[PDB]
């Protein structure tokens, strides 16, 4: 005979993530805590009660069925991630909706202790076993509104019990049914989104079609990057040199494109190679990177040009 019982702790608490930028991921800690855990599900196929006459084997396992995603009252949907799980064993990648953290405490503990082997729904016991804290770090989309939040996140947490006749007891609740269990324990999460700016997420290539040998001497091309923003912001931009240029231009910024060809690279019309975009009010702003080519017959060479630069953003 095999016999399974579960209790749900139903823990309540709140965690202040504090002030974060939209790109920043805030965090909360889901502590396991002893307390008075109520039975809510069981699968019984053995003796109802236990006595001194006959022995039986044990297996106790913990559970925390934490939801994979949540949506704010604002209607925007938050995403949760596991920063630090601990000695807990997460055991279900396949299912999307919830994480499945669990820990086997006992296994094959041959015990004679008399009492209730199948407490039916609504009965209670005082669980007094500790486990690790499970830490979570939350993901916020750029469109999240600025200000204070208070996301109430429900979850199940509790200790599965398995009393058994057979040696080497191995019975565990299915993941599907684990999801359906009462999410009695949930902890409010409070955090503040100050917001922040994020640049365009794209390839920065600037293309010139034809080598043209000597004829393409002062050839021009350029490309633009968006830089969206929620709040007021300064972003000191500085083009940096990777490939060292062949010729010298006084205060103009330059990059070697190879074969005795430079590119005088500019940003918002600046040969100097430094600018500054500023945000008084919110919204995006474009940033226009000029590449002007330059060579001279003395060291002009046939071949395919290519160089590079590093547009460095000094966020103060």
């Amino acid at each position: 005979w095999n016999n399974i019982v579960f209790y749900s702790l139903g823990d309540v608490n709140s965690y202040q993530g504090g002030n974060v930028v939209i790109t920043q991921r805030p965090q909360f800690i889901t502590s396991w805590r002893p307390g008075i855990a109520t039975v809510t599900w069981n699968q019984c196929n053995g003796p109802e009660f236990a006595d001194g006459f006959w022995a039986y084997y044990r297996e106790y396992i913990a559970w925390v069925v934490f939801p994979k995603k949540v949506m704010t009252q604002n209607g925007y949907p938050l995403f949760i991630e596991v920063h630090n799980k601990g000695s807990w064993s997460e055991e279900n990648t396949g299912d999307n909706d919830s994480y499945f953290f669990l820990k086997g405490y006992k296994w094959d503990e041959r015990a004679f202790d008399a009492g209730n082997l199948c407490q039916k729904p609504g009965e209670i016991t005082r669980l007094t076993e500790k486990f690790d804290d499970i830490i979570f770090k939350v993901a916020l989309p750029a469109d999240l509104p600025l200000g204070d939040y208070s996301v109430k996140i429900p979850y199940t947490s509790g200790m599965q019990r398995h009393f058994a006749s057979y040696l080497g007891a191995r019975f565990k609740i299915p993941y599907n049914v684990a999801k359906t269990l009462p999410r009695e324990n949930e902890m409010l999460f409070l955090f503040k989104n100050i917001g922040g700016c994020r640049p365009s997420a794209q390839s920065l290539e600037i293309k010139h079609g034809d080598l043209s040998i000597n004829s393409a001497n002062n050839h021009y091309a350029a490309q633009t990057l968006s830089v969206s923003c929620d709040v007021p912001a300064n972003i000191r931009f500085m083009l940096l040199r990777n490939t060292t240029p062949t010729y010298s231009h006084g205060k103009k910024f330059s990059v070697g494109l190879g074969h005795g060809w430079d590119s005088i690279v500019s940003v918002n019309g600046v040969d100097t190679g430094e600018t500054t975009m500023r945000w008084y009010k919110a919204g995006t702003q474009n940033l226009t990177i000029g590449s002007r080519l330059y060579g001279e017959s003395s060291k002009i060479q046939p071949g395919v040009l290519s160089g590079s630069a590093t547009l460095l953003m000094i966020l103060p």
Partner: protein, 215 residues
């Protein structure tokens, strides 16, 4: 097009390390995220009291990841009664481009890094650090800061609107320094900070002769 999680990073002196999220927001291509630390002179420090690991990593298109700022016991040579300044950089390395004449550009964030000892460890609550003393002199104010902390003032004006909107060359005041900045005299002044968490507050002042304390 990898980017960082925060504008500016504060290293707790009590703790041994800290994790900063990055994320390859380009979803068509994979990228390499070079990560490094620089001293207050903005030069690279390779064995330095703080170090960042890993120095390079492949981020698959769309993939988010971390970097680890951490300590070496030559941190004890730092001063413990005040913050020390570093900068944590991050440079994206693109896939070398398809063969055509092409200039390749590469984004790089360069945030501030504040080693803050445990002796001066801040309250969890945004602590004030509001003690500031704008002193009038020819050409404008001379801003005192006798706090043991780095403080970037981003604006100065007559009102909360002027400080927020009005043009001003940003100044970072080292702990225990006084520095002159150019500005028109204000009957009641307004200085705009950038706090640990990143948002830009506004302090308002009360000028009793040369000395102006906060309200």
């Amino acid at each position: 097009a990898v980017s960082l999680d925060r504008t500016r990073a504060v290293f707790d002196g009590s703790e041994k390390s800290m994790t900063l999220d990055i994320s390859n927001d380009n979803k068509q291509l994979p990228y390499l995220a070079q990560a490094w630390i620089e001293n207050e002179n903005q030069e690279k420090i390779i064995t330095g009291p703080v170090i960042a690991t890993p120095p390079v990593q492949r981020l698959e298109p769309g993939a988010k990841s971390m970097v680890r700022l951490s300590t070496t016991p030559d941190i004890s040579k730092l001063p413990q009664d005040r913050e020390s300044l570093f900068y944590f950089n991050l440079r994206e390395i693109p896939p070398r481009s398809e063969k055509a004449n092409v200039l390749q550009i590469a984004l790089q964030t360069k945030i501030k890094l504040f080693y803050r000892p445990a002796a001066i460890k801040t309250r969890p609550n945004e602590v004030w650090q509001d003690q500031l003393i704008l002193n009038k002199v020819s050409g404008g104010y001379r801003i005192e800061n006798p706090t043991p902390y780095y403080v970037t003032v981003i604006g100065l004006g007559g009102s909360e609107k002027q400080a927020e909107e009005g043009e001003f060359e940003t100044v970072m005041l080292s702990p225990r320094s006084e520095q002159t900045v150019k500005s028109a005299n204000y009957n009641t002044p307004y200085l705009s900070y950038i706090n640990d968490y990143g948002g830009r507050p506004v302090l308002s002042f009360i000028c009793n002769g040369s000395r102006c304390s906060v309200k």
